[PDB]
Symmetry: C5
Subunit: 288 residues, 5 copies
């Protein structure tokens, strides 16, 4: 049992405050993001609408999830003379974040695949692999960290982490292939953006596995705090800052389809205060 | 008596965690689905809007229902240090799922019937039968499993299950007939989709009856866990993965009506990244 | 003495059934509310009052039934196979009255909206119906719950009689409005409105009947019958009957389109049969 | 004479039920109103949209406010042998309504001023908002804040100060209506005047209910005060809400008929068509 | 050494006033949020970022003030001496920081969005402003609450100074962005942006001032002043100032319409004066 469960460490009043601060800030940040995404939903064409639906979903899930995390945090610790002593529900705080990831990660995959121009059959199978892979990845981590022996078995904590890494590789491969296959077809401007979005979205992922193995280096009120805050900052940075990257690709791809004369969009599309497309209406049709 | 109520079995800390995980994940999955369905609502024409309304409703019901299920689970169990001992309200967890099905299943019927080209009163009669049948199917199961003798009576548990199966057959027949009657009128591409949707939507149903009869083979923390999780996974797989099927049919049927020149749609309709219809605006009218 | 229903003890089976129907009802309204909202632009500006009223009714019902459910959960205490009523049990019955007070009046407006009543004639009718319906429920509430904690037989009867007076006033005005409008409407519209009017008003009888049941004694079974019957009645009326009014509005909209009186942006379909074709208002060049 | 705080009176089980009934009914009535206002938001042009925004806001504030009032009522009283005995939180019920008025009243001003006709319009809005805001705050200070509302002197003094603000508000609005009436069409002229009169008249009820506690305290009086205010809030904030909207719609239809601007959908008032549907002329850039 | 405000006992009158302003504020935001949402299509696609930012800020404020209200209700206990602070009283002050952490940054984006800085320069400007404003509040939270439960006078001041450094960085970038954009804008537009920039930035001073009040001692009256003043400040800025940014966007939209740069579906009206007439995009063949 070389594993030192983080929900066992007692927290200082200062630490307790910091965790709460970041958790709520995150939740509010998602509310702001969710609102933005919704209002800026018709800035994209019908073809890439799946990208908008996915991100809005991810943000929605994150908001509600972080509300549960906050609740668990409030019911997970009790105030004493020595600070905030963990109770039976403390484990729920860590558990809830996994739930978030289980649904959030898969949706991200779809978002990237949505902006990716993979056509017909190749695309459908890719989606299934990515979703199942990402879903399994988090489930394996949850099993090892929380489900098995109340996360007290050192070997499983590692074994399942390795199994998860397997899925992480499967996911990255499929996505990277899809991005690589689509890059040549896109315009130079589009090509650069997709690659940029793909790299930004996948890079951050490493932080999560790193934070997962931190408990092995021992237990501490400070460590527990670091684990929670780091993960929170990571969730916000990725699920928020990276959210715009996918959207931008969709918008440009939309404007390009307009300029190219492939389709007509109701409103002018602007990126970085530069006009990419002009407002257009479909030609009136007289039915038989 | 041979019936071993699942809400009587004690659950391990691991089991308790797993159940919670799947329940919440499911609820969140529905929120994501509900959001998607809403945003992708104008991708369909006015003719097949009933399909969109039904699915969004089903998802909405599921979301709220699973919230109740989750709450009951949290307020339905207590920790004894030997696991989680059921409260008097734990039965509510199982009860709530029935409530979900009672409202959710009927809406599904309407959704399939909506994509179906069955028109006139004959189709209206079909809707009434499907809804009433599906509604009764779940109610009969609820009566036997929970209402009668607090689910301690083996006779009712089975009798009512059989009565329910009767309704299940009535529902499947009407729906299958409606799909079969509509299939010939639809285009080849549309024909394939409806059949596909019909098969996928109806097939899964079998899982529910199977899980219902599991308690007869005894009671255990593991079994109780299997029952709950399996049903949850089933609900998500059907109410979600199967939801897209109906929507796609509606979109294509809309695009076809556009191409055929029968009707006009404001935006281009894309399926599988392949354009099915082009942007169109109705002719300006003078009075 | 009047045998108050909130005094009778309920079996575990009975308690479960009541909960089942209450929640199912609430969820049914959520499904209805969602449908009504999505299918709001299927109607013209002229009959929008009908849409606003139904969506309102459904919204009120949903929230109301949530309160009813809460009251039900806090109104009874478990005693090993039996549920003994507490001081809050009365609230369950009280809450339904609140629902009716707001819900019934909105229904009136909905029917009157689809009705062809023009000018003041229409406005006057609405005022009478709303005030009448509003008072009818209030009178019942006073006799059944407010006066002597609902234990006075004389008041229970007196106020019910007063209520019936208002019920007659309401039915008369509405029936007249429907009868006056039927001749002007098309055959297809005539059938729907008449059907809606008849369907909407007929069910009302059930409510008064259930009200006087307590007089014939008190029992766990009776109390169960009262609650469930009212719930089934609320759902059947507020839901199944909701479509009837909406359909009239849609057809009346399509008729206005075909007749060339007005233009609708999208095609209107009833029972899979096209009633109207998509039309756009003629572009106008303002003086500028 | 003597100020007798209403949150001191014990309430009967019957009284407790009545108050709950009206409070919830009111809240639900606002939900129904809020939904209607939202659905019937595009029935008005861009010029008078401030009227729609204001009313929807007022209704929204009222709904949430009445939710707090209901909560306070549930946590403000404890059930006893003699009925429902007030606790420390009972005062919150009365306090919450003031909060509602402080935000709700100002929005109403904007709504009427929105339908009303330049630069001096902005000044008028500032006066109305500040005046209305202060009027309620002054009453709050005297009735609740000062000496826990047990002082007859302030209860009256501050009421008088408030009345001063009430006069300022009514004057600005009355002037705005009077100044605008001549410019508007006869049909529009009648509407605005009608709306102005209906919106301002009711206000008197609030001050009247305020001074009732002076004539003593009782479970019945406390009940009368609460219910009357509730009925008043619903009647004004709801029935009166339509008045402003109608003016906006007609003024929109007039702009359409006159050819000044175009509206996408047909505008109907009293089951009578005011404007036929129109789309803006396609523009090349 | 620092007299924490959550240590002072409050009178029944004081307790009532704080509650009054807090709720009024929350409701004011609800009214604002509703208005902003309904008046979202009064602006063009080009300046939509401004609308998205303000609606977000208002949304955050509303929810935040709900938490502040809850904390206030669970932070004090009624006694014979008035309302005695408990362990949760500190949360009231803590929650406001959370609000500011998300609210302030969004404001920056809103002003920068109306600002015409083009290319990465605006994106670079955005990143600095967001991070600067974010850090500013975090530093204050650290010193006021996190460090020694706000009992260390040196930190209370040190971190305040560090924060002020960030405040200067933020003001500079924004002022530069406004100054750089001002020349490109029309005279009418130019005036509004400057006014909005000045109005948005000026108020900021109040917050730092209120922060250092606890140093001059602790009291039920002072605690009351701190809370109410901040609340009034939040509403006045986040609300009254919200319109300023929006108005600029609307005019800039109308100008683009008149100039023939873009087409807007509906007429745009500011102060009851028509700025742009309704226009529909030309139907296109593919
Ligand atoms: C929006 C949130 C995201 C993208 C979260 C991602 C999380 C991971 C990539 C987690 C991966 C893990 C491993 C590869 C090994 C250890 C267990 C996990 C689940 C933390
Ligand atoms: C979205 C959820 C769905 C479609 C659930 C379906 C459930 C059934 C088809 C249940 C059928 C049953 C029987 C035929 C016998 C035993 C009792 C039931 C209700 C489980
Ligand atoms: C959505 C619910 C509806 C339309 C409910 C209608 C209820 C009534 C018509 C009630 C009438 C009553 C009497 C005429 C006498 C006894 C008391 C009442 C209120 C139940
Ligand atoms: C929507 C609610 C409205 C318009 C409420 C209005 C309230 C008043 C006009 C109150 C006025 C008062 C006085 C003039 C004196 C006493 C104190 C007040 C605030 C009740
Ligand atoms: C919408 C709310 C706003 C803009 C709040 C602004 C707050 C500040 C400008 C705070 C600045 C501070 C310092 C510069 C020093 C002391 C600590 C702070 C955070 C209060
Ligand atoms: C918007 C985030 C809300 C998080 C849950 C808050 C629950 C109540 C606690 C308040 C302190
Ligand atoms: C079986 C009980 C629930 C069925 C609900 C079906 C949806 C009803 C929608 C009605 C709309 C008016
Ligand atoms: C309209 C449906 C009424 C059902 C009443 C059920 C009565 C409960 C049985 C136990 C006595
Ligand atoms: C009006 C809506 C209020 C919502 C409140 C949500 C949080 C409640 C926290 C209660 C803690 C005891
Ligand atoms: C729409 C008004 C509902 C208010 C709910 C207040 C809480 C009641 C008990 C739960
Ligand atoms: C039963 C004693 C309380 C009755 C007072 C109710 C007054 C209602 C006034 C409405 C106008
Ligand atoms: C009762 C003493 C406290 C009152 C403080 C009022 C401060 C208001 C600041 C407005 C800016």
């Amino acid at each position: 049992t070389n594993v030192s469960v983080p929900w066992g460490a007692t927290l200082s009043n200062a630490e307790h405050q910091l965790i709460f601060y970041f958790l709520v800030v995150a939740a509010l940040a998602f509310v702001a993001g969710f609102i933005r995404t919704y209002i800026t939903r018709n800035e994209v064409g019908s073809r890439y609408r799946t990208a908008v639906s996915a991100r809005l979903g991810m943000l929605g899930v994150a908001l509600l999830a972080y509300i549960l995390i906050i609740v668990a945090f409030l019911l997970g610790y009790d105030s004493t003379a020595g600070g905030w002593v963990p109770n039976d529900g403390a484990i729920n705080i860590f558990s809830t974040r996994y739930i978030e990831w289980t649904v959030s990660v898969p949706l991200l995959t779809i978002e990237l695949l949505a902006v990716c121009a993979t056509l017909g059959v190749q695309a459908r199978r890719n989606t299934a692999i990515a979703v199942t892979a990402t879903g399994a990845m988090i489930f394996c981590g949850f099993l090892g960290a929380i489900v098995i022996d109340n996360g007290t078995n050192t070997g499983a904590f590692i074994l399942w982490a390795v199994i998860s890494c397997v899925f992480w590789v499967i996911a990255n491969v499929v996505l990277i292939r899809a991005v690589r296959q689509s890059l040549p077809t896109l315009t130079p401007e589009s090509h650069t953006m997709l690659k940029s979005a793909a790299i930004v979205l996948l890079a951050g992922w490493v932080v999560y596995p790193i934070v997962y193995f931190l408990p092995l280096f021992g237990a501490s009120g400070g460590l527990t705090t670091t684990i929670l805050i780091t993960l929170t900052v990571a969730d916000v940075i990725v699920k928020l800052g990276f959210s715009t990257q996918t959207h931008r690709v969709a918008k440009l791809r939309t404007a390009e389809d307009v300029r190219a004369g492939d389709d007509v969009h109701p409103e002018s599309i602007w990126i970085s205060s530069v006009k990419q497309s002009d407002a257009g209406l479909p030609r009136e049709v007289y039915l038989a």
